[PDB]
């Protein structure tokens, strides 16, 4: 409990964790060799250089005032009253405070200092709570917060195309706040978490083993995002050693590049990506620090205590338990290492020096050897104006690459530069090697990855579907999508269910590929209807021969009328053509019905035995009825059948959908009436002709009646298609023509 | 010169009473505030004197006072409050407990300073929402309600009068911005939303006020406005409203309160205004103890001299500052005086409870509590005080309690602005809001049921329960109502449910039970004649057969076919009977059976005609009868089979101006009757063709002429009626009428032809 103090025009405050936190009666016990002592001389070294150099505050001497905090909230808070007691041992005003290595310690000091308008810059505080300027108006950091660590790993997953990931955390401010930041960044970049959970401080292997087992049940995620401290980091690796599996670890600053994390379990941690803060070593500081001895370092009171603890020797009042310190003893590089945050401490000291120099230059134009009116200091002008807007190169830069520029953002947070460390096996010996950097955009070296590019783990949920054959549905989580197959005869849907085009459309690779591709009465007539047509053609040839001999004979008109009906029926089969037409279909139906009517009515005159005029008049009535349908709006253009239920690629329309429906009913009614009259008339007549003629006339009547009766069920069960519809019509008309010609030509041939 | 009011005691209590006014920039602490600084300081002094003497509250421990000033400033308040912890960080005296800064910024700064140093604070007068946040101020308590409890009171009073469409007026800075957000959020649950969330700045022009009043007037259906403004802002707003002749049922926050100066100069435009003020009562003991003080009596107060010099224009050199009575002088007690003594007594109760729970050995303050900690006191004793308020009226009951957020209980007195019959304009109390709302509705004449109350709903819904179609996003507060279409029903209040287009919904708008129809609507046109003809046809058959029976034993009848005559008579009776019974209620086996029999009956007549002309044309008789019987049986069997298979009966027109048709199973009989009609037509056509070649021999008393007449008549009637039947099939009513006429006409023609043989037999 002492205080470094050096008189000067301006003095900078100091708060360092010189003594580690203790318990019992003593508030703080052993001295901190690295966090406290090493950072103590770094600020003293930096402040000494400022005075020596004439390019920064030439006529202004910067003082020093450092107070121990012992890593305790209550003790550090009560030690900050000295910096404010003189703003109302002679008290002296404090220009600013450069201290605070623990987030809890800095929070307590920031709350007290913000009320009294005293700017403060911390050198290691990475808490996200201090980023809320509403609660802490006057606070700045030379180190990035924990927000950027989540952002850096968020871009890592996007760069490696990792979407299905598992996140873990730890109890405390670090684990809880860090894991929340990752979720916000992942939402914008489209990364979904899996089995997210947190671990406690119970330090029980049973709980840790349960966490490891909880990763086993989810094998789609082989990458684990770590937001836990170094204390329990080794425990999880040790826990993961039992029942080992394959996992990829994406850790944070807690793991870092420290080799103490892995101890005999370097197989489960293989191929792990860890983030560590970038910190170049300071060459000048090493020479300065090694030249410190208790003989001349009277300013630092804690130096004597540090020497006793580090060397386990006593300088004054040495007892027999502890040997007296040997002479000519100095610290050397054999057992000395640089603290990871030395450059941050130096930058913090330079931040006020540059800010004070700028404020001195402006508020004291053409002045030196102290200032004018720089006795009372305004926090708002110095901090919010002349401290947040700072851009100067990092002092003592080993390479002067100019990439490291000390500046403060809108919230006062320092620039965020991180290092991506990859864990790999080289020469059979595991080691850490940096494989990239993260200033503002993630940069990675693919070639720098060794023995880990063989697999390139992905851990991706919902591998994209192919909309051509299966559609997409919404699962329980929006991020993942499931493949659902839809029926093949509907067009592609981008994200929704496949909408149905209708009937007769065949979708293709295009999204709107489905279109009307109707068939034109698919040519099954060559296989099916050709036979009846060839038979009909043979009948037509026989009819032509029958006509030729009848024409040659001159009374050796009734035969011509009967022959005309047979000839008209012959072309009925050829009337049906694959080419669609709204007039040919109507004409073919009317012609077929008319031909049957005249042929059937021809035998009516023979049974009754002037008569020619009546037959012609009766024939005209049948023709008038046939053309009566075409007069109305019954006729229409052919259209594809609505066979939505049937899985037919193409639709064929040949009957116009209005002709066969109406003509078949009309033709059947007309045929039935004439057939019934002829049958009754034949029986009533007492054979008013030759014996052969009477038998032939009677036999012909039964043949047409039997054929018409047999064809009646065929019409109902035709199921009009490209083949059955044409075959049924051709077969039925062929039988009627042959029967009429068979019973007429045969009696003439015999006689 | 800074001065401190200090008293020696075992436990000392801090103080930050703003005795000195802020003043201008030149004078940091100029005028002395007597109403808010001196009066409250004397109230605390009286409370401390009373608590010291009374042997029931910390009986042994004596309480001291360390009272400072804030000068209505934040930095000065922090500088003065630094002296509180100058002894408790480890002659200066340890200070435990302070009584707040009597402001918002001052109290916030003091709480922020004392949170880290563990010193409890109980502000007697501080109403802010920031201080209610425990994350930043976890050691702050107050005996006054926060600024969001009056929002609860105003929302509740708006709900009581069924007012939901309101316009909010805000103010610049604190008390005008935070209150609006809390009021809106609380009104979201109560289905109340803003209309014009207009804000008024601190330096806001008069013509600008007129423009804002016109902006308020832009909404026609907004007769109620809630005001969150300061006193002078409200005064200017009422002045502008009076100039523009705009009247509203003003609702105001604590800023208006019951102050007469706010309404003074703007009477007439503020009638019916509703205002709420913090509940408080005068203290007789403090009033007697403040009036029992003159400058030469009290020394303990350093600022008492300045208060005396400010209040009376005399001077302490030599002047009236020694002859001034101060007795029977116009004096008024500040509203927030009881809060100071309540806070002091709460601190005393907390300290007494701590001493009892930590030093139970002797009444003397034990040494075990030497390390005083604010955390334990605040968590256990400060926040768990439940005691009757000191000096409370006997009739009323008051208890000082703190909530989980450190805020005191809320009690607001609602005020109304009246028109006295003989007196001037003045305020009154009509209710209070402690835990539940209560008002005297009949007390207010303006806001009375008879004096034209203003709902100001802006979405009045006088639509009937069956005529609501409120389908519009609009505002969640209310929506417009539209009557539903007659074709639809109001089954659901939100959306009209068009369950059926045919039936008209009933009064309840839930009976979607369809609309029937009747086929028994007898009338002079379609029932008087058609029914008589069908009945007459059956009767005519009875008369015809009577002649035949009497003429049966006659040589003439022997030549004619007896079976043919009987078959024809039976067919005529059968067809007439079906037509007569056709006017009946349809069912599964009534309408379908009747129409099926009619087809068979018609075919019987055709069969009878066929067997009556074949014999004449030929010139075994049993063969013709058997053939005709087989044809009739075959036709009936084909029809009968079709009933089970392809005779489905259903039909109703619902969409176009129609209800369910009056039919059970004879709805699709047209398709079924097509086969029967085709067979009947073919039989009729065959008979006509045979009759053409028949009648060659005029035998049987020229009976062939009668047969030929029937063929030329029945076929002509059937052919003529065929287009009518197809046309009439579109409408069920027309089809039924035509069917009965056609059946009767066919029977009449057959009956008429057979009349001639009857006449010859009779004569
Ligand atoms: N700034 C640190 C970061 C610290 C931390 C770092 C890594 C892993 C866990 C972890 O725990 C938390 C939790 C909350 C806030 C900060 C941390 C600090 O301790 O405050 C670190 C510079 C201080 C030092 O020990 O040198
Ligand atoms: N707490 C009060 C209330 C005050 C206030 C009261 C009425 C109208 C306007 C108004 O302005 C605001 C704005 C924000 C918060 C509080 C207030 C204060 O002055 O802070 C008042 C007890 C203090 C006293 O009268 O000594
Ligand atoms: C990630 O996916 C992109 C395409 O979206 C591709 O260009 C890139 O090469 C991928 N990166 C990998 C596989 O590492
Ligand atoms: C408010 O509406 C309710 C309806 O539930 C009614 O009972 C009450 O009387 C109304 N209050 C008025 C009109 O002041």
Numbering used by the authors:
A (entry chain 3): 30 to 117, 137 to 604, 613 to 665, 684 to 825
B (entry chain 2): 22 to 111, 132 to 660, 675 to 818
Provide the publication's sentences verbatim:
Upon binding to the orthosteric antagonist, the two VFTs in the mGlu2–mGlu3 heterodimers adopt a similar open conformation with a common dimer interface formed by the top lobes. In addition to the lipid-mediated dimerization, two other dimerization patterns of the TMDs were observed in the inactive mGlu2–mGlu3 structures. An increased proportion of dimer was also observed when a disulfide bridge was introduced between the intracellular regions of helix V in the subunits (dimerization mode II) or between the extracellular regions of helices IV and V (dimerization mode III). In a bioluminescence resonance energy transfer (BRET) assay that measures glutamate-induced Gi activation, the crosslinked mutants displayed a notably reduced maximal response (Emax) compared to that of the wild-type heterodimer, indicating that locking the dimer interface in the inactive states impairs receptor activation.
In addition to homodimers, these class C G protein-coupled receptors (GPCRs) were shown to form heterodimers as well.
